[PDB]
């Protein structure tokens, strides 16, 4: 039902998911002038040396690259987090044009796309239990700008033609997510939500300041995916981003400067 089309997009979601108008919704604009440096934040620890990718799925809205999260393999800790968060999947949001596509904005700047690495807090045992908790998930958000190609993204771009339509999947083993990180792990953090239904208020957002560069050709290939299933009229998968939501009673903290 819900999507990003002309009649089922973000402004409609509240009708099936009333939390869409909640107190800690994501994404948000990051006002860099008002984000406060927090000397008590730790450096982020991203430990992806043992990550085990399995499969890539066109989920009907984006594509998920899925990881084996049955053991402590690929974990995020440190930064603003307590305990250990296990990577379960990553996906992106992107635009129909380079001037839009990110969910978070920075001083109202939209990036071409935004990568989300989703992790769940191991103290809750599994992802389904974790999304029921205010500290259940940590999502690491990375902006994409269009410029030089990102070599470590090419393996993702090249498998997209095999999962063009909703519900298609493909084997996707041995992919190393370290190739999608920028040089600096300086970040902003704030408490928020999933940005798609069910919009649960269970996420500690960590958004890296430094964007990665991808080529125009790479993001053009994202835009050839389809929201529709096989044998249905083509709906290009573009503009699958939720706009900035009210910050309300929240502080965005900076790990730097
Ligand atoms: C276009 O965006 C997506 O396709 C997308 C898919 C998954 C997720 S996270 C898991 C959401 C979920 C689904 C079902 C049950 C409990 C949680 C997100 S985000 N931006 O991290 O909120 C976006
Ligand atoms: Zn997302």
Listed in sequence order, the residues at least 6 apart from 252 whose beta carbon sits closer than 8 Å to its beta carbon are 28, 30, 31, 34, 35, 36, 188, 189, 190
207 pocket-lining for ligand 1 (C-beta < 6 Å):
no
φ and ψ at residue 63, rounded to 5 degrees: -125, 140
Is 33 part of any known ligand binding site?
A: no
Q: d(Cα 116, Cα 130) in Å, to the nearest integer?
A: 17
Q: How far is the CA of 194 from the centre of ligand 1 (A)?
A: 6
Domain positions in the chain are 1-257
Beta strands 53-58 and 169-171, pairing class = antiparallel
Burial class (CB in 10 A: 0-12, 13-18, 19+), 95: buried
Nearest Cα residue to 210 out of 186, 242, 228, 189: 186
62 pocket-lining for ligand 1 (C-beta < 6 Å):
yes
- Cis (ω within 30 of 0) for the bond into 62? no
Elucidation method: X-ray
- The fold for domain 1-257 equals Carbonic Anhydrase II (3.10.200)
Coil, helix or strand at residue 161: helix
Q: d(Cα 224, Cα 228) in Å, to the nearest integer?
A: 12
Which among 16, 131, 196 is the best mutation to test ligand 1's pocket, defined by most ligand atoms within 8 Å of the CB? 196
Q: d(Cα 234, Cα 1) in Å, to the nearest integer?
A: 17
64: left (phi over 0), alpha (psi -120 to 50) or beta: beta
φ and ψ at residue 26, rounded to 5 degrees: -125, 160
> Resolution of this PDB entry, in A?
1.5
Q: How far is the CA of 251 from the centre of ligand 2 (A)?
A: 21
The catalytic residue positions are 61
Q: d(Cα 223, Cα 211) in Å, to the nearest integer?
A: 20
Beta strands 137-146 and 113-121, pairing class = antiparallel
């Amino acid at each position: 039902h819900w999507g990003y089309g002309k009649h089922n997009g973000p402004e409609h979601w509240h009708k099936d998911f009333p939390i869409a108008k909640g107190e800690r919704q994501s994404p948000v604009d990051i006002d860099t002038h008002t984000a406060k440096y927090d000397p008590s934040l730790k450096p982020l620890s991203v430990s992806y040396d043992q990550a085990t990718s399995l499969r890539i799925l066109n989920n009907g809205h984006a594509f998920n690259v899925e990881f084996d999260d049955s053991q402590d393999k690929a974990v995020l800790k440190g930064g603003p987090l307590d305990g250990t968060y296990r990577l379960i999947q990553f996906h992106f949001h992107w635009g129909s044009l380079d001037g839009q596509g990110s969910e978070h904005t920075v001083d109202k700047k939209k990036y071409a796309a935004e990568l989300h690495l989703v992790h769940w807090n191991t103290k809750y045992g599994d992802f389904g239990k974790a999304v029921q908790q205010p500290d259940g998930l940590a999502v690491l958000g990375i902006f994409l700008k269009v410029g030089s190609a990102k070599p470590g993204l090419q393996k993702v771009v090249d498998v997209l033609d095999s999962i063009k339509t909703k519900g298609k999947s493909a084997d996707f083993t041995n992919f190393d997510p370290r190739g999608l990180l920028p040089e600096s792990l300086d970040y902003w953090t704030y408490p928020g939500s999933l940005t798609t239904p069910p919009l649960l208020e269970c996420v500690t957002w960590i958004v890296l300041k430094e964007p990665i560069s991808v080529s125009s050709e790479q993001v053009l290939k994202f835009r050839k995916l389809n929201f529709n299933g096989e044998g249905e009229p083509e709906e290009l998968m573009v503009d699958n981003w939720r706009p900035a939501q009210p910050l309300k009673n929240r502080q965005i903290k900076a790990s730097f400067k």
